[PDB]
Design a protein around this motif. Structure first.
Motif, mmCIF file in Angstrom:
data_model
loop_
_atom_site.group_PDB
_atom_site.id
_atom_site.type_symbol
_atom_site.label_atom_id
_atom_site.label_comp_id
_atom_site.label_asym_id
_atom_site.label_seq_id
_atom_site.Cartn_x
_atom_site.Cartn_y
_atom_site.Cartn_z
ATOM 1 N N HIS A 2 0.822 -1.205 0.000
ATOM 2 C CA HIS A 2 0.000 0.000 0.000
ATOM 3 C C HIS A 2 0.858 1.258 0.000
ATOM 4 O O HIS A 2 0.443 2.299 -0.519
ATOM 5 C CB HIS A 2 -0.940 -0.009 1.205
ATOM 6 C CG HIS A 2 -2.029 -1.032 1.111
ATOM 7 N ND1 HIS A 2 -3.027 -1.147 2.055
ATOM 8 C CD2 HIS A 2 -2.272 -1.993 0.189
ATOM 9 C CE1 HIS A 2 -3.840 -2.130 1.714
ATOM 10 N NE2 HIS A 2 -3.405 -2.660 0.586
ATOM 11 N N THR A 3 2.055 1.187 0.578
ATOM 12 C CA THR A 3 2.907 2.365 0.669
ATOM 13 C C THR A 3 3.430 2.840 -0.680
ATOM 14 O O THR A 3 3.956 3.956 -0.753
ATOM 15 N N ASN A 4 3.295 2.048 -1.740
ATOM 16 C CA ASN A 4 3.845 2.436 -3.031
ATOM 17 C C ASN A 4 3.148 3.684 -3.561
ATOM 18 O O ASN A 4 1.918 3.787 -3.546
ATOM 19 C CB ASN A 4 3.706 1.290 -4.033
ATOM 20 C CG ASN A 4 4.360 1.600 -5.368
ATOM 21 O OD1 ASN A 4 4.111 2.646 -5.969
ATOM 22 N ND2 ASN A 4 5.200 0.686 -5.843
ATOM 23 N N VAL A 5 3.952 4.631 -4.049
ATOM 24 C CA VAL A 5 3.406 5.892 -4.543
ATOM 25 C C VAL A 5 2.434 5.638 -5.686
ATOM 26 O O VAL A 5 1.400 6.307 -5.802
ATOM 27 C CB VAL A 5 4.546 6.832 -4.971
ATOM 28 N N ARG A 11 -6.355 7.198 -7.976
ATOM 29 C CA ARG A 11 -7.780 7.260 -7.690
ATOM 30 C C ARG A 11 -8.304 8.659 -7.975
ATOM 31 O O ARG A 11 -7.568 9.645 -7.894
ATOM 32 C CB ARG A 11 -8.066 6.855 -6.242
ATOM 33 C CG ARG A 11 -7.442 7.762 -5.201
ATOM 34 C CD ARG A 11 -7.633 7.189 -3.809
ATOM 35 N NE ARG A 11 -6.960 5.902 -3.670
ATOM 36 C CZ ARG A 11 -7.564 4.720 -3.689
ATOM 37 N NH1 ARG A 11 -8.875 4.611 -3.831
ATOM 38 N NH2 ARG A 11 -6.832 3.617 -3.568
ATOM 39 N N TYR A 83 -1.805 17.412 -1.396
ATOM 40 C CA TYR A 83 -0.808 18.083 -0.572
ATOM 41 C C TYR A 83 -0.614 17.363 0.757
ATOM 42 O O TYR A 83 0.520 17.171 1.210
ATOM 43 C CB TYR A 83 -1.196 19.545 -0.362
ATOM 44 C CG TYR A 83 -0.499 20.454 -1.344
ATOM 45 C CD1 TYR A 83 -0.489 20.151 -2.694
ATOM 46 C CD2 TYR A 83 0.177 21.587 -0.922
ATOM 47 C CE1 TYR A 83 0.153 20.960 -3.602
ATOM 48 C CE2 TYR A 83 0.821 22.408 -1.826
ATOM 49 C CZ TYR A 83 0.808 22.088 -3.164
ATOM 50 O OH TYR A 83 1.449 22.897 -4.071
ATOM 51 N N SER A 84 -1.707 16.935 1.393
ATOM 52 C CA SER A 84 -1.564 16.243 2.669
ATOM 53 C C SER A 84 -0.960 14.854 2.500
ATOM 54 O O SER A 84 -0.428 14.291 3.462
ATOM 55 C CB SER A 84 -2.918 16.132 3.357
ATOM 56 O OG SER A 84 -3.762 15.245 2.646
ATOM 57 N N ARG A 217 5.400 9.577 -10.214
ATOM 58 C CA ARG A 217 6.768 9.419 -9.739
ATOM 59 C C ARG A 217 7.163 10.695 -9.008
ATOM 60 O O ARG A 217 6.571 11.756 -9.215
ATOM 61 C CB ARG A 217 7.732 9.119 -10.894
ATOM 62 C CG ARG A 217 7.481 7.777 -11.571
ATOM 63 C CD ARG A 217 8.254 7.638 -12.866
ATOM 64 N NE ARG A 217 9.695 7.685 -12.658
ATOM 65 C CZ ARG A 217 10.595 7.502 -13.616
ATOM 66 N NH1 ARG A 217 10.234 7.260 -14.865
ATOM 67 N NH2 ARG A 217 11.888 7.564 -13.311
ATOM 68 N N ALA A 218 8.175 10.586 -8.148
ATOM 69 C CA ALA A 218 8.530 11.681 -7.255
ATOM 70 C C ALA A 218 10.033 11.668 -7.001
ATOM 71 O O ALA A 218 10.738 10.721 -7.359
ATOM 72 C CB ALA A 218 7.752 11.585 -5.942
ATOM 73 N N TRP A 219 10.515 12.737 -6.370
ATOM 74 C CA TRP A 219 11.932 12.888 -6.069
ATOM 75 C C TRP A 219 12.086 13.827 -4.881
ATOM 76 O O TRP A 219 11.179 14.598 -4.557
ATOM 77 C CB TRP A 219 12.705 13.442 -7.269
ATOM 78 C CG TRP A 219 12.756 12.532 -8.452
ATOM 79 C CD1 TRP A 219 13.688 11.574 -8.711
ATOM 80 C CD2 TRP A 219 11.835 12.503 -9.546
ATOM 81 N NE1 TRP A 219 13.404 10.946 -9.898
ATOM 82 C CE2 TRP A 219 12.271 11.499 -10.432
ATOM 83 C CE3 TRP A 219 10.684 13.228 -9.862
ATOM 84 C CZ2 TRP A 219 11.596 11.200 -11.609
ATOM 85 C CZ3 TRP A 219 10.015 12.931 -11.032
ATOM 86 C CH2 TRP A 219 10.473 11.927 -11.892
ATOM 87 N N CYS A 220 13.259 13.755 -4.238
ATOM 88 C CA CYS A 220 13.679 14.753 -3.257
ATOM 89 C C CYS A 220 12.621 14.989 -2.184
ATOM 90 O O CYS A 220 11.909 16.000 -2.230
ATOM 91 C CB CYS A 220 14.019 16.070 -3.952
ATOM 92 S SG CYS A 220 15.645 16.081 -4.737
ATOM 93 N N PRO A 221 12.476 14.080 -1.217
ATOM 94 C CA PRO A 221 11.437 14.249 -0.190
ATOM 95 C C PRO A 221 11.458 15.622 0.463
ATOM 96 O O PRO A 221 12.432 16.370 0.330
ATOM 97 C CB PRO A 221 11.770 13.147 0.825
ATOM 98 C CG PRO A 221 12.509 12.119 0.046
ATOM 99 C CD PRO A 221 13.269 12.856 -1.015
#
Lengths: 230, 232, 232, 232
Positions: A2-5, A11, A83-84, A217-221
């Motif tokens: 479930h944690t996968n981005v 959804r 955002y949250s 996809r994402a980068w740089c927390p």
């Protein structure tokens, strides 16, 4: 898993509610704007999670908690859920759009264009009937029966490599506001009725908008919003 | 077995760019072969490559596709313009027209110049490009710092010039609703290097022409619908 | 043959979490490669593992992420709290924030402590955990019966602590609408074992900090929609 | 090619017992293993086989699961009843309850008896079954013609009895709206064969109990919906 981005950001969620077009109309003009203009509001919406005001990009979010006053009110929006959800300096994904009516037994069509372009104005006259040119063009136009349902997927359409969640640069050498991005959007959406302007009606129509992210996809927390101890 | 009817989410809709085909109407048709027509076209790049002539408004409604070298001398460039396809100078070139029907472009821009003047006259010219900055450069001294090249009058008659593709992205905005880094890319200018020679009894005021064409790597993207203003 | 139309039971419906795709709209697109960006993210566990600093309301609106060892002595623990993610103490930690967006969790919880004080001072500390019971333990004597560990001041400066995962189920409620066995899991406390040493002319009131992080087996489940209160 | 739409005859319908599945809603879920629970159940026959105790209304609202052998003697049987699951006697047995939720049954019926009385007492008993006829048999003489068996008091304490499955069909009606051949199957009775022995100073009025269970070939069919009367 479930944690996968990807498993998280797949959804549909509501974005905004807009009225239904009935004429060519004038597009909103940049800020600051003086009075007396014919530009109309509440018909065009930009596809962007970041805050926006009056169908244009923005930096600071506002709300009309005070109803009374004078002047013209404005629209605003922000993806609370996105955002949250998590922290990512950068992001990219295909944007999926879906629309459903908010009125009894209505039929219509929807129109879209990508970033960098702008609304096409003016209208023709056929056999003494006036029709805006936005009916036909190079870009898709969708048609649905009564009741209504619209769905399709738009590909990435911005020059920037990714979408910056919290940017801090500037776009132009002179007067550019720091931190305000340029083309972090998938374009603009609008709705209209396939009827001549000569048969305009007074009653207003309203429609909601839902969006969904595909292949995120994402980068740089980064950090997360603060919550009070009140 | 019976139709395992799986209703579709949003059927009974009309979509502009649906790729699939539809039902044939009057099939079993034959056509006259057209192999005898030459000059087939594949992509708009074929027309985009062929050069054409730009123009400028007459110096104080008649635009001019030529420029004549003046007798007077000044440190400022004789002719310069921003490299932005929305400018009027490109507003009739084939490359500009084609680009006007797309969201964005990518690749280099090619420029050509031609001279038309007397027999026994000679001179020198300097070509330069300047990326964007606070304001357009004015003095040949300031321009010299930027990238430049030397074009001799007498060596050849068309010293071809190409502006390199430089930008902090993968593409650039074909049209500029608002000035932006990705939209404008500075300017290009020409400077008279030295006084030209005026031989006996030859006419004066030579004539120079400029042509533009898309580079080999030129490419467009994201088609759009046209502006129908030209009908008026 | 003709369409063996098998009508579907409940077609012509819109569903939020329909997994399948839809019709492409503007296919045949190309994108700029993004391999040059480092720091890719795969799952929220990457952020959940990195520790952060908790806080507490100032002892008689300013929460404090540090605690200073007092000179006074009492048998009660100096700082303790229930292990329940809904408590304010976790209300700003990364682990707490992430957990707030899920139905339930699973795994151990990791705690870290740090000291900040004088040079020539020494002391002893006792760490303990207490499962739920009639009421929170008060005396160090009662606490000693429960699981505990010894942390010396001088051996190291951060005696890491992890609360074991104990529960009569496979998961536990992330939020507690009503107190329940599966929701709360007792408390954790720290006790001053012996009086610390005050050397010559050194400052007083040392400072201690605490950090929390998710254990290697930490896992969430059943995503939900967020509370939008933070906008206000 | 395009959808060769073959419309279905009666789609857009809702059916109670449609076997096929539907669209998943919140897939990708994990569950806690449940192998640790013993006593798994496969079919209702497992419960139907285990015997239980019937009952009868008290001889002149208290039903009784036991019968005591009287001192008086008569040629009529001491206890008898029709073999019809709708009768009150089965109205609380597990077999009767399960059968009440089906259209029809099939197989034999098993009956068990138990004695509870003094030490030094002995006697004899006769068991018999009678198919349907004009009216229930009354005299032990008439019953003797039918199928019967001898059960001695002292040989054992539970002389198990099974009614053979006899019917002019493949099944029989679980409930009898109207008396019919396929519904009722006669009666079963017990007769006191000889006077029992009363030893010195022992108590009187021994006690006998009866139990019922489904035979190995017992089978139900055609499920139905229950009567909700028991809520009241």
């Amino acid at each position: 898993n479930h944690t996968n981005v990807k498993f998280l950001f797949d959804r549909s969620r509501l974005l905004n509610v807009i009225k239904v077009l009935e004429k060519d109309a004038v597009f909103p003009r940049p800020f600051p704007t003086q009075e007396g203009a014919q530009q109309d509001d509440g018909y065009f919406c930009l596809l962007t999670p970041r805050p926006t005001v009056a169908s244009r990009p923005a930096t600071r979010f506002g709300l009309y908690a005070n109803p009374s006053g004078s002047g013209v009110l404005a629209n605003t929006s922000l993806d609370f859920n996105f955002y949250s959800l998590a922290c990512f300096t950068y992001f990219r994904s295909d944007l999926e759009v879906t629309v459903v009516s908010l009125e009894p037994d209505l039929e219509f069509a929807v129109g879209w264009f990508p970033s960098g372009s702008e609304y096409q104005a003016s209208s023709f006259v056929y056999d003494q009937l006036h029709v805006p040119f936005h009916f036909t063009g190079r870009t898709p136009r969708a048609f649905a029966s009564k009741g209504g349902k619209v769905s399709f997927v738009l590909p990435w359409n911005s020059v920037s490599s990714v979408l910056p969640v919290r940017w801090g640069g500037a776009s132009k050498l002179s007067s550019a506001t720091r931190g305000l991005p340029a083309h972090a959007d998938w374009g603009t959406i609008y709705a209209f009725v396939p009827r001549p302007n000569e048969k305009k009606s007074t009653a207003v129509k309203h429609v909601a908008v839902y969006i969904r992210y595909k292949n995120a996809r994402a980068w740089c927390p980064s950090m997360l919003p603060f919550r009070s101890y009140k | 077995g019976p139709i395992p009817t799986a209703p579709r989410e949003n059927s009974l809709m009309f979509l502009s760019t649906l790729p699939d085909d539809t039902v044939p109407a009057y099939g079993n048709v034959r056509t006259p072969p057209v192999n005898y027509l030459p000059g087939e076209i594949t992509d708009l790049l074929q027309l985009a490559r062929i050069p054409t002539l730009m123009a400028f408004e007459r110096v104080p409604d008649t635009y001019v596709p030529y420029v004549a070298v003046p007798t007077q001398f000044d440190d400022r460039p004789l002719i310069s313009f921003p490299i932005t396809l929305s400018d009027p100078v490109y507003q009739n070139t084939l490359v500009g027209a084609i680009s006007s029907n797309f969201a964005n472009y990518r690749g280099c821009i090619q420029i050509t110049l031609t001279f038309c003047g007397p027999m026994m006259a000679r001179g020198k010219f300097l070509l330069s490009y300047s990326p964007p900055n606070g304001t357009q450069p004015q003095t040949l001294s300031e321009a010299m710092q930027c990238t430049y090249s030397i074009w001799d009058i007498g060596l050849n008659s068309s010293w071809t010039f190409v502006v390199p593709y430089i930008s902090p992205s993968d593409y650039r905005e074909t049209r500029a609703i608002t000035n932006s880094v990705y939209s404008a890319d500075g300017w290009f200018s020409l400077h008279k290097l030295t006084k030209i020679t005026l031989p006996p009894d030859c006419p004066q005021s030579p004539c120079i022409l400029f042509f533009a064409s898309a580079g080999e790597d030129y490419t467009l993207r994201l088609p759009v619908d046209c502006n129908p203003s030209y009908v008026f």
